From a paper:
DNA sequencing of the output from this selection revealed a distant clone (clone 18-19) that differed from the consensus sequence at 15 out of 80 positions and bound ATP with far greater affinity and specificity than all other clones from that round of selection. The X-ray crystal structure for protein 18-19 was originally solved by Lo Surdo et al. and found to adopt a novel zinc-nucleated α/β-fold not yet observed by nature. The fold is characterized by an α-helix (residues 6–20), followed by an extended loop, then two short β-strands (residues 33–36 and 39–43), followed by a second α-helix (residues 46–56) that leads to another extended loop which terminates in a third β-strand (residues 64–68). A zinc metal ion is bound by tetrahedral coordination to four invariant cysteine residues at positions 23, 26, 46, and 49.
Protein DX is the double-mutant protein isolated by optimizing protein 18-19 for improved folding stability. We determined the X-ray crystal structures of protein 18-19 and the evolutionarily optimized variant, protein DX, to resolution limits of 2.8 Å and 1.65 Å, respectively. The structure for protein DX was initially solved by molecular replacement using the coordinates from protein 18-19, and later solved independently using single anomalous dispersion techniques. The Cα backbone trace of proteins 18-19 and DX can be superimposed with a root mean square deviation (r.m.s.d.) of 0.51 Å from residues 7 to 71. From this comparison, we found that protein DX exhibits significantly greater thermal stability than protein 18-19 (79.5°C versus 57.5°C, respectively). The Asp32 and Val65 amino acid mutations identified during the evolutionary optimization of protein 18-19 are located on opposite sides and faces of the β-sheet. The largest structural change occurs as a result of the D65V mutation, which eliminates the R21-D65 salt bridge, causing a significant repositioning of the Arg21 side chain. By comparison, the Asn→Asp mutation at position 32 does not alter the protein backbone, but instead results in an ion pair between Asp32 and adjacent Lys47, that is critical to balancing the dense positive charge present in the ATP ligand binding site. Indeed a slight repositioning of the Lys47 sidechain toward the purine nucleobase can be seen in the crystal structure of protein DX. The results from these experiments revealed that mutations N32D and D65V, located at solvent exposed positions, significantly enhance protein expression, solubility, thermal stability, and ligand binding affinity.
Numbering used by the authors:
A (entry chain A), B (entry chain A): 5 to 73
Write the structure that this text describes.
């Protein structure tokens, strides 16, 4: 089923690329309508980036959650 | 740059999962507005599926080509 191909891919993408900052924890994310937003950092590193004044790693990638647009 | 994270991922996704039918050739695809449609089969297997009367492998997965929805 093509929706399952998309879901399996999103599980893999989320699993295999951890937080860009600590390189260990999984990334924060949210659901944004029909999209999954995967932020670049875990929550702990993101909150810390605000404290330390670094926006270098801020950002996200949005993924359509379904196989058909 | 977050758009590059998306583009690099789409290159990887396209590369690592060949045609679901012959298991060798890369899949057919097209650009569908702001989406990349990756069909399940290469063109040769898709055309052949029409000739042989099998719709089992018909289908596709659409991917947003940009990091921000
Ligand atoms: N965990 C995180 N890691 C990296 N960047 C993040 C993280 N959380 C938020 N950001 C950055 O913070 C900014 C705000 O994100 P957010 O998803 O809240 O945007 P939005 O579209 O304004 O949604 P809303 O206004 O409803 O919160 C974006 O630059 C986003 O990439
Ligand atoms: N190479 C292929 N492998 C598997 N399935 C395919 C392939 N090419 C087309 N299909 C299937 O054929 C059908 C038509 O696809 P297509 O992308 O042409 O749809 P569409 O949204 O009707 O666009 P248009 O009407 O502009 O052609 C869909 O079920 C699609 O998955
Ligand atoms: Cl996507
Ligand atoms: Zn982290
Ligand atoms: Zn094939």
């Amino acid at each position: 089923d093509d929706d399952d191909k998309k879901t399996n891919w999103l599980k893999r993408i989320y699993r295999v690329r951890p937080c860009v900052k600590c390189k260990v924890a999984p990334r924060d994310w949210k659901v944004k309508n029909k999209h999954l937003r995967i932020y670049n950092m875990c929550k702990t590193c993101f909150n810390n980036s605000i404290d330390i004044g670094d926006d270098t790693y801020h950002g996200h990638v949005d993924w359509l959650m379904y196989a058909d647009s």
